[PDB]
């Protein structure tokens with residue numbers, strides 16, 4: 001089986017998967033890949049995943065990418081609790097729906113702050129104020145939608161109990177926070193849903209799942225951060241180039 | 245049951261779903277919503293889907309959005325052929341993985357041309373060349389990935405037979421084409437994959453699923469296009485504002 005999971009705990013979709021696996025207690029070989037360094041671009045890694053993206057899971061000689069795909073697969077193969085990924089048609093539909101919306105309106109919008117504050121200047125590139133602002137108004141714009149649409153009255157985005165949907169959302173949301181953005185400030189619903197999940201995941205897990213990222217802003221200050229490889233240097237420029 | 249599907253055949257995720265339902269022959273009440281007009285923003289529609297996005301399906305009093313979520317749900321509830329959404333763990337994982345990647349690298353990048361050429365100017369807004377270019381190089385950049393990563397040797401992105409993965413990709417791909425972008429030009433693998441799918445879907449269905457969009461560029465020239473409502477006008481501004 002081997003079952004290895006290549007990931008960097010800085011990447012949020014990496015934490016989401018790492019957390020699910022850990023909490024459900026699934027044997028996994030944690031394969032660290034310094035993203036900031038450019039290891040996911042190493043010839044060796046590309047031999048594992050041509051896309052050079054994290055996280056990617058290798059079960060046997062079957063390599064799979066995409067936290068969602070991974071998360072689901074994992075959940076299935078290991079028959080983890082159903083509340084996680086309900087077999088109920090209506091219930092699972094609600095999960096998928098959020099994941100879809102998540103990829104459209106959450107992923108890629110809530111990761112920008114790290115670029116603006118860390119990765120961006122790491123290679124000398126400074127993000128234009130316009131986008132920096134445009135980004136944040138975009139964020140809360142989406143935080144609200146998330147709040148009264150998915151969260152609404154219920155306790156979770158996908159329904160009545162913690163679900164993959166939550167693990168993704170919060171992990172993705174925690175990034176800006178780790179940079180000093182308190183998106184929960186004036187959103188009791190959010191704060192409460194967050195506090196809820198954190199509650200269900202246990203301080204220990206979360207306390208370690210995060211660690212890396214809440215420290216990063218510092219290694220940034222103190223220049224502990226590694227110099228990106230040219231292959232990562234290029235990927236970085238691309239991503240920054242697409243921040244609207 | 246009622247089972248109604250609100251959609252505009254201009255939106256690609258709308259076609260994808262409309263096609264699947266049609267091809268699998270699933271009773272559905274086609275509920276047209278002039279996107280360009282701004283009907284998906286009509287107080288009435290919002291009573292149906294707060295997000296004001298298309299397509300959305302209403303089965304009973306259970307309203308669900310997101311083509312993927314929809315597609316899957318539909319496929320399940322109506323026990324349509326398995327090749328579509330394989331129950332095989334490894335096989336379904338491959339689907340999900342593409343859908344994930346699709347939402348990241350396909351959706352939102354291949355729809356831009358219509359904005360640049362149609363919707364943009366429709367409201368007086370002209371898209372900057374930079375982005376117009378940046379966009380296309382981004383497109384083929386992704387078309388390639390798609391080509392040698394998902395399509396690779398095999399006949400389909402998700403595996404050996406047509407799958408939701410394909411229905412999404414091609415429907416999303418067809419847009420730029422409909423505007424005059426032949427993304428299949430120097431990509432036999434693609435063209436061939438396309439030709440294959442088109443083959444499996446039957447000229448009739450596809451000939452009607454498209455119609456609307458291949459004519460649009462003209463109603464644009466001839467000014468047949470409706471004046472967007474201010475609620476659509478604002479939506480449009482936002483989207484255009486996020487074209488990097």
Ligand SMILES: N[C@@H](CCC(=O)N[C@@H](CS)C(=O)NCC(=O)O)C(=O)O
Nearest residue numbers: 011012013052053054066067235348
């Ligand atoms: N949709 C994928 C996206 C993965 C992704 O983009 N990961 C980042 C780390 S935060 C990465 O590997 N970036 C480098 C690259 O893709 O070139 C998922 O959520 O699993």
Ligand SMILES: N[C@@H](CCC(=O)N[C@@H](CS)C(=O)NCC(=O)O)C(=O)O
Nearest residue numbers: 104255256257296297298310311479
């Ligand atoms: N991720 C969703 C996106 C749906 C979407 O953005 N649809 C467009 C039509 S092409 C729309 O409704 N735009 C108006 C808006 O969202 O304000 C899906 O693919 O189902």
